Amino acid sequence: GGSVIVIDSKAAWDAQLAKGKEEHKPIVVDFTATWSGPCKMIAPLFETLSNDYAGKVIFLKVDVDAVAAVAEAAGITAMPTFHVYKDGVKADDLVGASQDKLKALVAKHAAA
């Protein structure tokens, strides 16, 4: 129950990145896997933050095994990974399930 946009394909990924560019809003992405406990531990927080920052920050989810072409091009190797995209390109990242660092990352880019 939040505002996260699920990415199903490279085409969908490219469209969302272009939307963030056109809107001048930052995108935060959770690259996640069903088999990762840490991903499960932080997924509820990602969803809550998508509500708290609705209208300000765009939240995407990429299941790395469902959309392997996007995970590979993004250079993912540990789960969860969070990226921030601005102007169609990567601007920031976090790897791991630190709730404090995720909250701070979203706050930073919402305030920038």
Author numbering: 1 to 112
Task: Give sentences from the paper.
Thioredoxins (TRXs) are small oxidoreductases that contribute, in most living organisms, to the control of cellular redox homeostasis. Indeed, they reduce disulfide bonds on numerous proteins involved in several processes, including antioxidant defense mechanisms, photosynthetic carbon metabolism, and protein folding. In addition, TRXs have been suggested to control two additional Cys-based post-translational modifications, namely S-glutathionylation and S-nitrosylation, by catalyzing the reduction of glutathione-mixed disulfides (–SSGs) and S-nitrosothiols (–SNOs), respectively. The redox activity of TRXs relies on the presence of two Cys residues in the conserved Trp-Cys-(Gly/Pro)-Pro-Cys (WC(G/P)PC) active site motif.
In the present study, we deepen the structural features of CrTRXh1, providing the 3D structures of both the reduced form and variants in which catalytic cysteines were mutated. Regardless of the reducing activity in which TRXs are involved, the N-terminal active site Cys (CysN) is responsible for the first nucleophilic attack on oxidized targets. While the subsequent catalytic steps underlying TRX-dependent protein deglutathionylation and denitrosylation are yet undefined, the reduction of protein disulfides implies the formation of a mixed-disulfide bond between the CysN and a Cys on target protein.
